[PDB]
Amino acid sequence: CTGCVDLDELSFEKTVERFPYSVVKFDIAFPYGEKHEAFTAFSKSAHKATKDLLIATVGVKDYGELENKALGDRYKVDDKNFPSIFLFKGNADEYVQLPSHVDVTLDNLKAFVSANTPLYIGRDGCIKEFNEVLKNYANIPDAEQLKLIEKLQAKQEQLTDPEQQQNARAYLIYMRKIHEVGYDFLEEETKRLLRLKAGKVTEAKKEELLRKLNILEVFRVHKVTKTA
């Protein structure tokens, strides 16, 4: 359950022209392996961040009736090129290809998009509507902290997405702990989370300690201006 839309000669152009941006991987039919799995993980990750992006695949068939070959031929790619990654800005007409020297990996896929579009893909854990109102939270007066706590508590209760609901909880506990103790909390919670990340941890536990750390990074400031 990927979110990648598989496209053909009949659906490709009609579909790309209905989204603000598209990222399309051209490869073999029935694709498989690490670069495919990196693309797949890029797709789940982009759906958690945005609604303006199509993530898609085109399978090119050499032997048979020839399905999608006219499509690979339109954009100048072959079995010698595969996989080829294209970014479309609303039409099948103007695009940018990922350079052939760049590894197809999740971090490279996400950098490709923001470098070329007005879209943020967030770090895992983050919620764009909370980040939008939390810049410099730790330096603002008590009475503005307490009004933001109350505002983002009321948004939390209205969240419909299960991961957002979970991530939001961590935001609030930090908002409150920082209000109660000051900037000194940042150091205490970082030391707590990096002690755990440095033990023997599975891939699933690593990713979850990373979400907490990404959320807490939001609370970091460049100078302390608030007394106490």
Swiss-Prot record:
Consequence the record notes for mutating residue 27 to A/S: Affects subcellular targeting of pip but not homodimerization
Key word Transport present: no
Location relative to the cell: Endoplasmic reticulum lumen
Protein name: Protein windbeutel
Effect on the protein of changing residue 6 to N: Does not affect subcellular targeting of pip
Effect on the protein upon substituting residue 29 to S: Does not affect subcellular targeting of pip
Effect after changing residue 36 to Y: Does not affect subcellular targeting of pip
Effect of substituting residue 63 to Q/L: Affects subcellular targeting of pip
Subunit architecture: Homodimer. Interacts with pip; the interaction is direct and does not require pip to be folded.
GO process annotations (BP): dorsal/ventral axis specification; embryo development ending in birth or egg hatching; maternal specification of dorsal/ventral axis, oocyte, soma encoded; protein folding in endoplasmic reticulum; protein secretion; regulation of multicellular organism growth
Result of altering residue 63 to S/F: Does not affect subcellular targeting of pip
